[PDB]
Ligand binder design. Structure first.
Ligand SMILES: Nc1nc2c(ncn2[C@@H]2O[C@H](COP(=O)(O)OP(=O)(O)O)[C@@H](O)[C@H]2O)c(=O)[nH]1
Length: 162
């Protein structure tokens, strides 16, 4: 059974936990930072071991997951300009800890269901293009893009491993 260690990074409140809950537990409440579940992606049974982190008290565990993380979701919220601005910092942090320019990553613009938008889709597409990674628009509330975000990351890890 293939195992993938995934890390979901981004500013506080962008919906990292909400995205992961929706993926793993299939629900959303508008009111756990680690998850572990087996799913089937493209017919391959895959154990996902996931950490959600903004960069929290358990720094040692964070450093471990950053070092061993095989793929990263870089999450911002479409109604949070600062969270979009923070993405570069998170990506640079990952590249440094992993000592590599070729780390599987997906850019995720969450809260796509909300009518308040301050980050344009073109801005995000442009940034992802510069990084050479996929961009996926998501909503943890409506499930838009959720499986696609995580499964695309798993596919980016596979591309990296072979
Ligand atoms: N409308 C909407 N609210 C969301 C979405 N994702 C998260 N939230 C809400 O945003 C707030 C912060 O989410 P949370 O998962 O705790 O963010 P985290 O700090 O990145 O883990 C919560 O009130 C969530 O219900 C989304 O896609 N749409």
């Amino acid at each position: 059974m293939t195992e993938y260690k995934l890390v979901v990074v981004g500013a506080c409140g962008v919906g990292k936990s909400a995205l992961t809950i929706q993926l793993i537990q299939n629900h959303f409440v508008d009111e756990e930072d680690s998850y572990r579940k087996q799913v089937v992606i493209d017919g391959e049974t895959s154990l996902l071991d996931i950490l959600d982190t903004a960069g929290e008290e358990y720094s040692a565990m964070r450093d471990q997951y950053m070092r061993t993380g095989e793929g990263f979701l870089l999450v911002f919220a479409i109604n949070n300009t600062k969270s979009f601005e923070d993405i570069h910092h998170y990506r640079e942090q990952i590249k440094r800890v992993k000592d590599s320019e070729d780390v599987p990553m997906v850019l995720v613009g969450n809260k796509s269901d909300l009518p308040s938008r301050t980050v344009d889709t073109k801005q995000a597409q442009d940034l992802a293009r510069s990084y050479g990674i996929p961009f996926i628009e998501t909503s943890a509330k409506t499930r838009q893009g959720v499986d696609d975000a995580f499964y695309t990351l798993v596919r980016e890890i596979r591309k990296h491993k072979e």
